[PDB]
């Protein structure tokens, strides 16, 4: 979905007084067919008959033109009407799939003039925009808010069998029992759940103003757990990856690739080709994910730190003075980083 | 209104099948868009979209098909139906005075091709006809019955008055009393008469089967008026004149000039100023209304008459035997001019 056409459906988000108009319109029934332009001098073959207004715009100005038959007229940045009830007349050679004379003008105004044009029809409740080649249906709010908290219902399921899946997972990884499978699972939860996010996007964007409340959902649900996937796929990749390579991975598996178990084992270096396999796959874990979210030690340093011990099970067999040798390690970073994987230890295992 | 439109109008006139599907579609109100060719594939290009039919005409399908949106195409002879549910798309820079898309389309569309496109708005209930650069409004018949009733009853009034003037100056005639201003005074009324039928004549052809009784309606009341315009003209024109040419003053004083006192009696060839001269302009009928009408010898032998007798009054005086002098009058033809005028003499005198 072009960013240019974006930039377009944004004029008639929830939010925008062309937006309140056009739902005005919606509920009493009127049509309408808008025609944006920012010369209207230069698009004087296309227009033919109404009445030249060159006023300011207002929503309640263009409910009340909508009254009349023909189309409206206003400038490209929405400040002015420039034409009420008058008729377009785009070059009728232009193909067409739409249905009824409203929208076939439309689409082809729209593709004659590189120009926005909108539609409306008197029975239905949908917002047709035309831009170039581009058509764009845009849905009632309602509509889209019935849609998002089904979505956001979803995406509580698949993160409350994420957390659950991380829990035994931890444990898994503080007793050094961590197989393939454990690792791939919790991956794969946590592949869908940003996909199901990447999905409901557009919808949360056509909500406008009205997606506000939806936004701080999918923020709250989501916050970490990019950087906890990443985190684990720095952790049990075959061989040591940089961050912004595990970046990738995750990048992949969200919009390209389908998180299947064993596409998930491959990319992250591990030649198995059946699922049976991973459980008998024993993993260490690096010990990045607990050295940056527990100890909080940036990920710059923790490098050091992994360069050095190699796996977490050595880093929690490392006394602080041990510790203390990395190259940017000082006592409080040390100490941090013993004390909090003891506390774990302690608590969860 | 030239007869090429003039068929066309007849197409959709009261009593065509067409026409009682137009009635109820406006009474559905519905509109309608009808497009007549007899070549469909010819006219591909300003035909996008709709349903190929190719099946025979009825008024109920036409009513059915009108319920779909945009337009209807129709055989010349309105046999077929060949598409509905159809976009027309005639060439935007006609230059058209129409308003809407409907009619703008219409008169557009009639303009490109030659051919008829019929359209009804779906609030008005008048039919616009348009076939090349014409436009033709076809109304309904209660408003058609409404006018011709008021013209009839016009007429009615003027035919009796008409009736009054002839009678009085048939009185003038068999005295030999006539004065320019009486003959004058009795033409412009059957001239005025005449006038009141030429201009609701469109209404009772627009009508069609509907003016049945209308058309019987004029005839009755005018049925010899113009015969009888005819032989006053021969009877007082200033100088003989043929029966050809008196019907081509009749024709005149009906269609251009107006039958103004002073112009009927300059036409009749008497070099008058003003009206009140003709009071004094004394008059004497040849003859040939009476011979005519009363003694029904026909115009050919009435001439012969003439001739001979020169006026009424003296062919009043003439004896069987004087009459019989003349070629073409044997003692029946004479005794029907001698007792027919001594009879109209004792009677109305
Ligand atoms: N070239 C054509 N070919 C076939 N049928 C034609 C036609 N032009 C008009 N009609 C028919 O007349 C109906 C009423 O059009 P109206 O202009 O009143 O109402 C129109 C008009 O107000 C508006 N509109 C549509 N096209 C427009 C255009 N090119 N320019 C400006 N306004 C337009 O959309 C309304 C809905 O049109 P809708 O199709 O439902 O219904 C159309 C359509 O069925």
Redesign the pocket.
């Known amino acids: 979905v072009p960013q240019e056409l974006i930039e377009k459906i944004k004029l008639i988000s929830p939010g925008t007084e062309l937006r309140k108009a056009l739902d005005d319109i919606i509920n009493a029934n009127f ?1 309408a ?1 808008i025609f944006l332009v920012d010369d209207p001098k230069k698009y004087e073959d296309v227009i033919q008959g109404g009445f030249w207004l060159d006023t300011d715009f207002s929503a309640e100005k263009l409910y009340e033109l909508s009254k009349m ?3 409206i007229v206003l400038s490209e940045d929405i400040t002015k009407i420039y034409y009420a009830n ?5 070059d009728p050679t232009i193909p067409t799939g739409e249905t ?3 929208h ?2 439309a689409e082809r105004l729209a593709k004659q003039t590189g120009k926005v044009v909108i539609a409306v ?2 029975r239905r409740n949908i917002i047709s925009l035309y831009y170039k080649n581009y058509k764009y249906v845009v849905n009632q709010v309602d509509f889209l808010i019935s849609k998002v908290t089904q979505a956001i219902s979803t995406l509580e399921k698949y993160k409350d069998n994420f957390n659950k899946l991380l829990s035994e997972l931890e444990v898994l990884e503080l007793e050094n029992r961590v197989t393939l499978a454990d690792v791939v699972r919790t991956l794969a939860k946590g592949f869908e759940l940003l996909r199901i996010v990447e999905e409901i996007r557009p919808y949360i964007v056509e909500l406008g103003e009205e997606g506000r409340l939806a936004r701080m959902q999918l923020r709250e649900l989501t916050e970490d757990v990019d950087d906890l996937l990443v985190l684990l796929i720095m952790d049990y990749s075959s061989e040591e990856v940089e961050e912004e390579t595990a970046q990738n991975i995750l990048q992949d598996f969200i919009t390209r690739r389908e998180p299947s178990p064993i596409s998930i084992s491959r990319v992250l270096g591990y030649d198995v080709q059946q699922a049976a396999q991973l459980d008998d796959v024993l993993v260490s874990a690096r010990g990045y994910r607990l050295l940056k979210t527990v100890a909080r030690i940036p990920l710059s340093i923790g490098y050091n730190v992994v360069r050095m011990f190699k796996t977490l099970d050595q880093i929690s067999k490392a006394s602080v003075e041990d510790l203390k040798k990395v190259e940017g390690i000082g006592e409080k970073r040390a100490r941090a980083i013993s004390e909090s994987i003891s506390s774990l230890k302690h608590r969860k295992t």
Chains 1, 2 share one sequence.
């Open positions: 049509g067919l038959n023909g189309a008058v008729h377009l007349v785009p009824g004379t409203r076939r003008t029809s008197r």
